[PDB]
């Protein structure tokens, strides 16, 4: 039995077409429609209860708690199906792909994502710059949350999941996107993605911080924020050991220009040690030597980046200290990422 969770705000002119084509695609099968409307200044909450004659439609309206992810959480609570399908009422999400979503869940996947960006997937009547802010955020997600590194459209509002995935789980009401909360905090072993087409208005830069604020939150939960802190404490530890050996070498008659080289190299080694027994102690794999060599490529990558970022900022007219500092900060940035996805890959 399938519950099709449709959260709404000001959506009257679609419920007809919506329910018609939901029912059309699911003809015969055991399904319901749980609608969660947050007291719409629109007839929606009433028109749905109206349409509950032709179509299997439950309608909960709430007067005290609103928000999309807030709804879907309740949409889970108030459902009664073996499989949840979540989508949007506007019809940007086609009810006809819903049968693919469940079939996929039938053949053993825990979560079936309706995906813009798998082979088969399409986006139309979207401009290039709105099309690629998308792939760019998605790209911040996949890199920053290694759990979902391999998911093409992990920010979809259109997905199906077994009821088990999200039960006994405190999903977060605020979270900007609920499918994300689920991929991070839910219980599962398999995820597929189904190709669909995004069907036939702007959004300020404030929600961009809201999306990023979500990702920072997922990160604290996942422990990455914790790792990054410790990684930084080593980084400082290395910045110290680099200098301490330099002084120790110039004073023993090693010309600074020769001296710097063992200095930096013992500094890369020091860094490797403490990261491999503190920050990424959990996720070590294979040869320690192969991990060591990996770390070197990451150090080097961090340095090449510091350099390039510094000069490009300078040439843009940025103050040398800001430019030097932004150089260091994006250097720890890239060094971490590579270490996280290559040196200690998972």
Ligand X SMILES: CC(C)=CCC/C(C)=C/CC/C(C)=C/CC/C(C)=C\CC/C(C)=C/CC/C(C)=C/CC/C(C)=C/CC/C(C)=C/CC/C(C)=C\CC/C(C)=C/CC[C@@H](C)CCOP(=O)(O)O[C@@H]1O[C@H](CO)[C@@H](O)[C@H](O)[C@@H]1O
Ligand Y SMILES: Nc1nc2c(ncn2[C@@H]2O[C@H](COP(=O)(O)OP(=O)(O)O)[C@@H](O)[C@H]2O)c(=O)[nH]1
Residues in binding site for Mn(2+): 90, 92
Among 2-10, 234-242, 273-281, 299-307, which window interacts with ligand Y (CB under 6 A)?
Answer: 2-10
Handedness of CA 322, 325, 327, 333 (dihedral sign): negative
Stretch that binds ligand Y, among 67-75, 251-259, 273-281, 315-323 (CB under 6 A): 67-75
Count, residues near ligand Y per rule CB under 6 A: 14
Using CB under 6 A as the binding rule, the residues of this chain from 83 to 142 that contact ligand Y are 88-90
- Here's the x/- map for ligand Y, 14-43, by CB under 6 A: it reads as ----------------------xxx-----
**Residue 164 is encoded by which pair of tokens?**
């088990």
92, 197, 237, 324: which one contacts ligand X (CB under 6 A)?
92
Chosen residue from 15, 18, 59, 68 binding ligand Y by CB under 6 A: 68
Q: Does 50 interact with ligand Y (rule: CB under 6 A)?
A: no
- Tokens 């404490």 sit at which residue? 233
Among 2, 3, 5, 8, indicate the residue that binds ligand Y (CB under 6 A). Answer: 8
Q: Which does 32 bind (CB under 5 to 8 A by kind): ligand X, ligand Y, none?
A: none
Identify whether the C-beta of residue 51 lies closer than 8 Å to the C-beta of residue 15.
yes
Smallest distance, ligand Y to C-beta of residue 330, A:
29
CA gap 246, 288 in Å, rounded: 27
Asked if 199 interacts with ligand Y (CB under 6 A), we say: no
State the Cα–Cα distance between residues 48 and 286, nearest whole angstrom.
Answer: 58
Which of 120, 104, 90 shows the shortest CA–CA distance to 197?
120
18 by DSSP, 3-state: which? Answer: helix
- Closest by CA position to 59, among listed 41, 39, 31, 42: 39
Q: What does 144 bind: ligand X, ligand Y, none (CB cut-off 5 to 8 Å by kind)?
A: ligand X
Question: Least Å distance between CB 71 and ligand Y?
Answer: 4
Tokens at residue 344, please? Answer: 């200690």
Does 153 sit near ligand Y (CB under 6 A)?
no
Judge whether 179 and 156 are in contact, CB under 8 Å. yes
CA-closest candidate to residue 142, choices 87, 192, 183: 183
Task: Assign residue 10 a region (left: φ > 0; alpha: ψ between -120 and 50; beta: otherwise).
Answer: left
The residue among 8 and 306 lying less far from ligand Y, judged by its C-beta, is: 8
Candidate list 1, 65, 106, 136; residue touching ligand X; CB under 6 A? 136
CA 153 to chain centre: 9
Q: Are 301 and 334 in contact (CB under 8 A)?
A: yes
Give me the residues that bind ligand Y (CB under 6 A), please.
Answer: 7-9, 11, 36-38, 66-68, 71, 88-90
Give me the residues that bind ligand X (CB under 6 A), please.
Answer: 88, 92, 133-134, 136-137, 139-140, 143-144, 155-158, 208, 211-212, 228, 330, 333-334, 336-337
């Amino acid at each position: 039995k399938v519950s099709v969770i449709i959260p709404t705000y000001n959506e009257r002119e679609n419920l007809e077409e919506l329910f018609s084509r939901i029912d059309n695609a699911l003809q015969g099968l055991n399904y319901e429609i749980v609608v969660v409307d947050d007291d719409s200044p629109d007839r929606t909450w009433e028109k749905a209860q109206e349409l509950s004659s032709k179509y299997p439609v439950k309608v909960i309206r709430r007067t005290k708690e609103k928000g999309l992810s807030s709804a879907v959480i309740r949409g889970f609570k108030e459902a009664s199906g073996d499989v949840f399908v979540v989508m949007d009422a506007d019809l940007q999400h086609p009810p006809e792909v819903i049968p693919k979503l469940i079939e996929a869940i039938k053949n053993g996947s825990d979560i079936a994502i309706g995906s813009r960006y798998v082979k088969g997937g399409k986006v139309e009547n979207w401009p290039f710059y709105r099309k690629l802010i998308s792939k760019g955020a998605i790209m911040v997600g996949r890199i920053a949350l290694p759990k979902i590194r391999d998911i093409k459209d992990p920010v979809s509002g259109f997905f199906a999941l077994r009821k088990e995935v999200v039960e006994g789980v405190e999903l977060n009401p605020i979270g900007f996107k609920i499918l994300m909360e689920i991929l991070i905090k839910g219980k599962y072993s398999k995820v597929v993605e189904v190709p669909f087409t995004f069907g036939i208005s702007k959004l300020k830069g404030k929600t961009i911080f809201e999306y990023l604020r979500h990702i920072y939150r997922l990160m604290k939960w996942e422990g990455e924020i914790d790792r990054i802190v410790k990684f930084s404490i080593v980084g400082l530890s290395g910045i110290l050991v680099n200098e301490g050996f330099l002084w120790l070498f110039v004073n023993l008659g090693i010309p600074k220009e020769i001296a710097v080289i063992p200095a930096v190299e013992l500094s890369i080694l020091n860094n490797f040690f403490w990261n491999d027994i503190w920050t990424f102690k959990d996720i070590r794999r294979g040869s320690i030597f192969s991990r060591l060599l990996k770390f070197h490529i990451a150090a080097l990558s961090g340095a090449v980046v510091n350099f390039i970022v510094y000069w490009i900022l300078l040439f843009l007219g940025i103050h040398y200290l800001i430019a030097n500092l932004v150089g260091i900060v994006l250097s720890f940035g890239v060094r971490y990422v590579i270490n996280r996805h290559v040196t200690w890959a998972t």
